[PDB]
Design a protein around this ligand. Structure first.
Ligand SMILES: Nc1ncnc2c1ncn2[C@@H]1O[C@H](CO)[C@@H](O)[C@H]1O
Length: 172
């Protein structure tokens, strides 16, 4: 009934990593997690992917807040994060920058990116550096599982990708 961080329909991969075929925006709206993770760039310019979807669900409040934050502080580091408002989706949004391997950024920074998750007991998150950032999503899930020690609920939008991640994980 009425709780916050109530996750449902996740496959338990390990003691602390869960995965679901779901839209992270729809999950955030239902669950109202303490922390939702944004797949951000260093400029917190929420064009496309997860960032575009989260911002649109806040009616652009996330972009307004992000514009103010970056004008004040300057860009993040690749592999870095910042905690900003979760607006109407969550208590907080953890903006995490994975490497963009399509722009020749170092894949090693994906581990740094996931390390940010360890400062929060429970997160709703997407797979970092997958899609337009061009990392292999199987590799991103492996780095997540090997790096994150806190409770992470992964939302994978694409049915085929979800099925491929689960089959490859539970047969290794
Ligand atoms: N709304 C969404 N919810 C969850 N994952 C998403 C969403 N939109 C894109 N993705 C996936 O997130 C990854 C990049 O952040 C890619 O695998 C991409 O398919």
């Amino acid at each position: 009934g009425h709780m916050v961080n109530s996750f449902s329909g996740y496959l338990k991969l390990t003691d602390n990593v869960y995965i679901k075929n779901a839209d992270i925006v729809e999950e955030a709206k239902k669950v109202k997690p303490t922390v939702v993770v944004n797949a951000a760039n260093v400029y917190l310019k929420h064009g496309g992917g997860v960032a575009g979807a989260l911002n649109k669900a806040t009616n652009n409040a996330m972009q307004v807040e992000s514009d103010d934050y970056i004008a004040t502080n300057g860009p993040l580091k690749v592999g870095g994060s910042c905690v900003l408002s979760g607006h109407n989706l969550a208590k907080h949004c953890l903006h995490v920058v994975g490497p963009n391997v399509n722009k020749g950024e170092d894949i090693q920074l994906l581990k740094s990116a996931y390390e940010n998750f360890n400062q929060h007991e429970v997160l709703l998150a997407p797979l970092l550096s997958a899609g337009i950032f061009g990392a292999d999503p199987i590799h991103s899930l492996r780095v997540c599982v090997d790096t994150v020690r806190t409770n992470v609920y992964l939302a994978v939008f694409d049915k085929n990708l979800y099925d491929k991640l689960v089959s490859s994980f539970l047969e290794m």
